[PDB]
Amino acid sequence: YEETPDVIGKSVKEAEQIFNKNNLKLGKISRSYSDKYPENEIIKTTPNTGERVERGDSVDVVISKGPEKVKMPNVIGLPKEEALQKLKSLGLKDVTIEKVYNNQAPKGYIANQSVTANTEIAIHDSNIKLYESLGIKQVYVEDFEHKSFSKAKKALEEKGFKVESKEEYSDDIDEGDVISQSPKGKSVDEGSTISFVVSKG
Ligand SMILES: [Zn+2]
Numbered sequence: 001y002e003e004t005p006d007v008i009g010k011s012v013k014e015a016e017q018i019f020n021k022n023n024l025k026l027g028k029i030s031r032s033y034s035d036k037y038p039e040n041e042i043i044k045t046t047p048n049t050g051e052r053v054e055r056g057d058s059v060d061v062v063i064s065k066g067p068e069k070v071k072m073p074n075v076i077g078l079p080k081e082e083a084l085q086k087l088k089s090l091g092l093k094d095v096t097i098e099k100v101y102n103n104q105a106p107k108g109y110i111a112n113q114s115v116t117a118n119t120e121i122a123i124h125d126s127n128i129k130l131y132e133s134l135g136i137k138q139v140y141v142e143d144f145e146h147k148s149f150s151k152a153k154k155a156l157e158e159k160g161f162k163v164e165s166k167e168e169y170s171d172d173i174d175e176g177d178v179i180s181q182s183p184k185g186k187s188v189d190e191g192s193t194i195s196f197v198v199s200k201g
C-alpha cells in the first residue's frame, strides 16, 4: 500500500517530516552503536525501506548512539595474563604492557592502568597502556666502615635510604668516622634503613 519512505541517515526530526508527509507517523525510537553512522543519524527502520506499509501506520526507527563503547574494568592487582584476558573478553585488545618498580604490587601484577577504572571507553583507538610490577628497586649500599659518618649520612640519604645511628667511645677510630655499618654495604635492597655505629671520641 506504499513504500516506506527512506530515512536511513537522517535525524528523527527530518524523519517525522518525511513520514508525516506520507501519512505515516513515526513512533518508537530505539538506539544503537554504529561503526557506519554518526550519533543521531538513523540506522534502520522497521517496516524497512520501501517495504510495504499501510497509511496511518506507524514506523519504528533505530538511531545511532555513536560507536561501540564499554566501561573500563579495573585490573589493578590482577596478575598480567589475567588482566589481559579480562579485557580481551570485553573487546579491549590494543594493550601495551610497560614494566615498572613497585612497593605494593607483586612482581608480575598490574600496579596501575592508563585509562581510569570504570570509565566508559571506546573500543575505537583505546591505546591501553598497563603498568606491570617489577618489585621494589634494588639500590646499592656503598660501604662506609671508616670515614666521616657525617658525609655518609649525606650519601645514603640523597638516594634511597634513611639512616639511623648511635655513638660509642673508640681510641681506634677517629671521633666521627664509622665503627660499623648495618646492611653490610655492597648488597642492594629497597628504600630500607641503614644503621651505623659512629666513634664517639
Ligand atoms: Zn538510502
Ligand SMILES: [Zn+2]
Pocket (backbone or CB within 6 Å): 053, 054, 057
Ligand atoms: Zn500496517
Ligand SMILES: [Zn+2]
Pocket (backbone or CB within 6 Å): 145, 146, 179
Ligand atoms: Zn674499621
Ligand SMILES: [Zn+2]
Pocket (backbone or CB within 6 Å): 147, 148, 174, 177
Ligand atoms: Zn677520617
Ligand SMILES: [Zn+2]
Pocket (backbone or CB within 6 Å): 168, 197
Ligand atoms: Zn660496640
Ligand SMILES: [Zn+2]
Pocket (backbone or CB within 6 Å): 169, 170, 171, 201
Ligand atoms: Zn677516647
Ligand SMILES: [Zn+2]
Pocket (backbone or CB within 6 Å): 164, 193
Ligand atoms: Zn628504625
